[PDB]
Amino acid sequence: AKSKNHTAHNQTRKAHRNGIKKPKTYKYPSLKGVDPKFRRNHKHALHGTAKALAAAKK
């Protein structure tokens, strides 16, 4: 027999019991999908800028 097809009734009630939150947040965020050459060079600008600091401790 035929039955109800669709509804969003009650769905925001359900979503808002323990939900929405926000999105989680971080300094130094994921580098997913950033320009590979730049990453490659960033890699090197970091090793260097590291190095140079340990040289400043002797």
Partner RNA sequence: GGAAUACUGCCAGCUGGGACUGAGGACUGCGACGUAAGUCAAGGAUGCUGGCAUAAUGGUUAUAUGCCGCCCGUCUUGAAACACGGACCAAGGAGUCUAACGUCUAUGCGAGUGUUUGGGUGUAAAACCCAUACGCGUAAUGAAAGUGAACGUAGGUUGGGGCCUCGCAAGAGGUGCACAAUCGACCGAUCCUGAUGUCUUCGGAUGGAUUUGAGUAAGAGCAUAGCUGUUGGGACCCGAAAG
Partner RNA sequence: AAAUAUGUAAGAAGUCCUUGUUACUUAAUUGAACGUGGACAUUUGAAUGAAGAGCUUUUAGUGGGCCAUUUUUGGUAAGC
Partner RNA sequence: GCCCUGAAAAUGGAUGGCGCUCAAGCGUGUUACCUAUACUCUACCGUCAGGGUUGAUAUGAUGCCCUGACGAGUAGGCAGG
Residues 19-58 contacting another protein, CB under 8 A: 19-23, 29, 32-35
CB of 39 to RNA, least distance (A): 6
Please tell me the distance from the alpha carbon of residue 52 to that of residue 58, in angstroms, as a whole number: 10
Residues 19-58 contacting RNA, CB under 7 A: 21, 24-31, 36-50, 52-53, 56
> Which of another protein, RNA, Mg ion, none has residue 58 at its interface (CB below 5 to 8 Å by kind)?
none
31: closest CA among 45, 43, 21? 43
Segment (H or E) for 14: helix 11-15
